[PDB]
Structures are given as C-alpha cells and as structure tokens.
Write an enzyme that holds these catalytic residues in place. Sequence first.
Site, PDB file in Angstrom:
ATOM      1  N   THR A 188     -36.385 -16.947 -16.410  1.00  0.00           N
ATOM      2  CA  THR A 188     -35.908 -18.282 -16.693  1.00  0.00           C
ATOM      3  C   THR A 188     -36.774 -19.300 -15.994  1.00  0.00           C
ATOM      4  OG1 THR A 188     -33.630 -17.681 -16.986  1.00  0.00           O
ATOM      5  CG2 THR A 188     -34.121 -19.935 -16.242  1.00  0.00           C
ATOM      6  N   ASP A 225     -35.409 -11.140 -11.364  1.00  0.00           N
ATOM      7  CA  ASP A 225     -34.610 -11.856 -12.351  1.00  0.00           C
ATOM      8  C   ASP A 225     -33.305 -12.330 -11.733  1.00  0.00           C
ATOM      9  OD1 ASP A 225     -34.084 -12.946 -14.925  1.00  0.00           O
ATOM     10  OD2 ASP A 225     -32.934 -11.197 -15.525  1.00  0.00           O
ATOM     11  N   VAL A 273     -24.639  -4.376 -24.599  1.00  0.00           N
ATOM     12  CA  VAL A 273     -23.629  -3.780 -23.747  1.00  0.00           C
ATOM     13  C   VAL A 273     -22.208  -3.797 -24.291  1.00  0.00           C
ATOM     14  CG1 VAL A 273     -22.483  -3.896 -21.559  1.00  0.00           C
ATOM     15  CG2 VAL A 273     -24.934  -4.199 -21.713  1.00  0.00           C
ATOM     16  N   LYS A 313     -30.538 -14.754 -10.886  1.00  0.00           N
ATOM     17  CA  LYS A 313     -29.979 -15.981 -11.405  1.00  0.00           C
ATOM     18  C   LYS A 313     -28.478 -15.859 -11.538  1.00  0.00           C
ATOM     19  CE  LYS A 313     -31.421 -14.669 -16.045  1.00  0.00           C
ATOM     20  NZ  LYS A 313     -32.158 -15.207 -17.207  1.00  0.00           N
ATOM     21  N   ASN A 360     -26.661 -13.480 -13.473  1.00  0.00           N
ATOM     22  CA  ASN A 360     -26.835 -12.093 -13.070  1.00  0.00           C
ATOM     23  C   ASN A 360     -26.157 -11.741 -11.753  1.00  0.00           C
ATOM     24  OD1 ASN A 360     -30.198 -11.664 -14.517  1.00  0.00           O
ATOM     25  ND2 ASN A 360     -28.168 -11.271 -15.396  1.00  0.00           N
ATOM     26  N   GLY A 411     -28.045  -8.862 -24.539  1.00  0.00           N
ATOM     27  CA  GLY A 411     -29.232  -9.676 -24.330  1.00  0.00           C
ATOM     28  C   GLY A 411     -30.115  -9.839 -25.555  1.00  0.00           C
ATOM     29  N   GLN A 412     -30.924  -8.828 -25.873  1.00  0.00           N
ATOM     30  CA  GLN A 412     -31.792  -8.926 -27.036  1.00  0.00           C
ATOM     31  C   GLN A 412     -32.057  -7.581 -27.674  1.00  0.00           C
ATOM     32  OE1 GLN A 412     -35.921 -11.184 -28.425  1.00  0.00           O
ATOM     33  NE2 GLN A 412     -35.626 -10.505 -26.283  1.00  0.00           N
ATOM     34  N   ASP A 429     -28.502  -6.533 -14.265  1.00  0.00           N
ATOM     35  CA  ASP A 429     -29.640  -6.835 -15.118  1.00  0.00           C
ATOM     36  C   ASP A 429     -30.936  -6.437 -14.423  1.00  0.00           C
ATOM     37  OD1 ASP A 429     -31.643  -8.139 -16.689  1.00  0.00           O
ATOM     38  OD2 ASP A 429     -30.073  -9.523 -17.414  1.00  0.00           O
ATOM     39  N   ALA A 470     -31.267  -4.906 -26.181  1.00  0.00           N
ATOM     40  CA  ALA A 470     -30.259  -4.086 -25.539  1.00  0.00           C
ATOM     41  C   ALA A 470     -28.908  -4.762 -25.745  1.00  0.00           C
ATOM     42  CB  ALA A 470     -30.560  -3.937 -24.067  1.00  0.00           C
TER      43      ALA A 470
END
Lengths: 278, 278
Positions: free
Chosen positions: A179, A138, A26, A140, A143, A21-22, A160, A24
């Site tokens: 989002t 969150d 994985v 979406k 996810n 993501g940013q 997430d 973090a």
Amino acid sequence: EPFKQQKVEDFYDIGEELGSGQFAIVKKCREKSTGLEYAAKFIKKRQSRASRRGVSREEIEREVSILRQVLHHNVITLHDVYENRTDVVLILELVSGGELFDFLAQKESLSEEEATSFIKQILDGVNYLHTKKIAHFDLKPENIMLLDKNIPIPHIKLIDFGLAHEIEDGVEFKNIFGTPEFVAPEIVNYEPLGLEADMWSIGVITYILLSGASPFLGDTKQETLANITSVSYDFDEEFFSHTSELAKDFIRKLLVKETRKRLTIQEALRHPWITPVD
Amino acid sequence: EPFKQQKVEDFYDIGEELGSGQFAIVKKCREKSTGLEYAAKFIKKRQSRASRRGVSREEIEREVSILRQVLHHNVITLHDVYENRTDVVLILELVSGGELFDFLAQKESLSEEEATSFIKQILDGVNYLHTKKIAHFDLKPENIMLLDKNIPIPHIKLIDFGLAHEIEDGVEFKNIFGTPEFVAPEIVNYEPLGLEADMWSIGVITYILLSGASPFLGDTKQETLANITSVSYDFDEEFFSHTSELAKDFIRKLLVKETRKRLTIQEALRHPWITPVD
C-alpha cells in the site's frame, strides 16, 4: 514437505467466504474430525506465463515456508496445507476479533498507556519474526486482527503473509510492493530492502493510532509517494494536542529515511514510551 | 464545464456491464433520443480521506479534462459526461473490435510489413497525443482495441485514460504506476517522467508483437523490475529467427534507459522500418 495433494473437502467443511484478496480467497471452515473452526485460504495457482491470474510457485512457497517458521502467540499460525490443481489451500488459524482498528473505533477514548499495550503486542509479534530474520513487508491496519474482541485488552494477531519475505545476509533484495501509504522510502525509491522497512510501518500505524490521521496520506498516490520520499509529516495540534512527547518521539525515531539510523525492533521495544525504564 | 448533474438513466439505457476496473465500472448503453450505442464508464467518487474506495476529484477531472482535449480518429472519444453523488458517468465511444492482440491471434503468421501497419497506427494516435503534450502512460495490449474487427486491416483505438497525464514544461512529475511489464525505467526508479515513457512501451509492444515473447517479463515482479532497470533483454533466435534487423533496430532504439537518447515519437515515425525512406 510438499502439500497434501488431497481435496480439502474431505477433511474440512468449507463454510462462508470471510474475505478474498485477489488470486487467493478465504472461507471459514471446519475440521471434520474435530468440529474445530479454522480459516481456509485458497491461493489460485497461476495459469502459465504472463498469466494475469494466479500466484507464482515461489511467491506461494515463500509464503508457506514462512508461515511454517513462525510460531508465536502474537502471530497467526498455519495449522495445515492441502494442494489440488486450481488452488493451494492453507488451513490457517481463525481470527474473529476483527480488525484491531475497527474495535478501537467502538472504543470511545484511548489512553496512550492503553495504546502502547496494543502497539507493544505488535512489537512482540514482529520481534519473533525479525529474529527468524523475516519481514512481513505488509504491515497495515487491515492486517492487524484481534483473536477475540471479547476481552478488555484483546490479543493482536498479525496476518496476510504474501508479501512476507525471508531476508538473507549479503543477498540484496529490492522490489516495489504494498500500500502506497504504509511503505517506507527504501521501497518507493526502488532501493535495498531490509527488516528496517517493517519498522517504518510501525511508526505510521502508531501515528494513525494516536492521532487518527495518516502522516503521509496525500490526495493522490502521486502526492503521497512524494511525502514519503521527502519524509514530510508534522505533528498537528489538531490531533497531537494531547499526546505526550514520549509518544511523538517513538514516532520520530521510526519515521526515518536512513535505514541504519531508524530504530530496530529490539531498540523500539526498549523505548521509554513502550518499556518504561523507570 | 461541470458535469451534467442529472441521472444518466434519463437520457440513456444502461445495459450490460462491459468491464469494471476498480473504482470505475463500464456498461454498454444507449442514447434514448437516438437509439445509438455508447459505452458508459462509472467512476465511483471517493468516500473521503483514506477512502480505500473511490477516485480522487483531481484524478477524475484530470482524466475528463484530458479525454476532452483529444479528438483523433485513432483515439477513443468522449461523447458526454454526467455526475450524480455516488459515481461520475462518462459517455464514451463504444469500441467493439476487441483487443488488437486477440485479433492478431486468430491469424497464423503476420508479415512485418503487415505488423508495421498496426504499429504505425499506434504511432499516429500517440503522435496526436504527444503533440497536445500528453502521455497515455498506460500503453498495453489490453488497451489497444480495434474499432471493427471486420476489415482486412482494422482501425486501432487507444483507450483507458486514467493514467493519462498532461505534461508541462519545467514542472517535474514522477510517480509509480502501471503494469510492471510495460513501464519504463524512469518509472521503476521513481524518476522524472515524460512522454519518453510511452515510447518504451511502444517498444515492448512491438517486441511482443513480433516475437510473441516479452522482453522483460520475469517470473516475479521482483524479477521483472530488475530486468527493466538493468535493461536486460535479448533477441532470442527461438523467436527472432525470422525478423528483419530493421525491426530489431526499431526495438533497440526505443528500449533505451536514457530519456533523451531514446527515440521520440516523431523520430520513431520517420524510422525506415516504419516509413521506408527509399
């Protein structure tokens, strides 16, 4: 309940990156003692002050604490947590079924009945949450994963949990996140947030799921936010020329601005389109 | 006024990457016909519908149109524009002074008079804009460059015009964008936006500039937004133990929720701290 201050390396074999993501990142991995696969999330601890990079200690803990409280099959599960000096490593359940949406892509035809299947799972998982008084905040398509795609009807898995927050009674919480497309109005108009939110998203997802079109997606965020705040969507025959009114209804009851008027998870579940009374 | 539909490579020598926001990427370059350096910004055209990647055509044009209208020395200038099928390439002036803020760092102390210097420039540039009825809407230390650092008192240069929008009379415009830290309340509370916004930021910059501490920076965005909406900041002696009231004043008149009550650029300029009457 601190985080093991050891190096993950020691007990696991960090493999390929599976996403990032940013603050973090994985990477697939393996438990040395078992040869068991897991997903390792690396959440870069924040630098210091206005530190444009790194996650706050709260936001961290807030995520961890949460992941720990949840233990439902339709929800991703946190095996372990290690902590060094640069990042904080979460050992999470590994999800390979890919993004539900993608799978559905390959599927060339979706019956509402079949659709409600997934949607329902989503509900069962969300239900667990909300009961523990928790908001994913969150929700979406990106996810909503699948355990293993290899089954006529896959096991949906919610993931997430950075934006997840534990709701408390009489303790107001508002903030602007997520989002543009899937956020509810109470967010856009910096207003009190509650589990209600997660529901709006459910609708949005369903709308997209059935029709393949987003109820509020505008040409520009600028544009979208207006749609959401003005609650402007329609049921274009160009997509809903086959859908049952029962479906549309479900939708209608979730895409509602007024918190208390919008359906609650429990409500949403006992809805004919989902749980056929007769 | 379309974009030259040629390949930039033909007239320019794309060099190193100098920066890359998200759907746009910047790389230093050279004009073949002149051996003149320029900065080339590549704005990845959008895929299509919900295209998580790519910039809307409007957002695009809206930026270009704008940059074309501006032609002030304290403002970055667009030399040219090319357009292929993947991206849209903008040939912008090249700014090397780096970020004003970074520069200021190297310096031990800073005199208010000296500080007002920069701040003033900022005003002069912003003034030009506002007059053309334009709002940068993205004023922040990261966007306040220096032409050439090599002068006792550098030439400040405003850049990044993606969030820049042309304000029109009797045509309402609200939206949620920008860094949590530098946005004004009319933004946070999805309300009517105007040039007024840019001013709030001027204040925030100055506050940071003088004290080195951010008036609203909270531990969490969640936190920050509340400070901004509640308009909660102080003049802690731990930093303002030296600052003139004249300065503080300037600040106070910009960090104001009520649009019409906050200082206008013109007002801000004729303010003693800036333009000493006597």
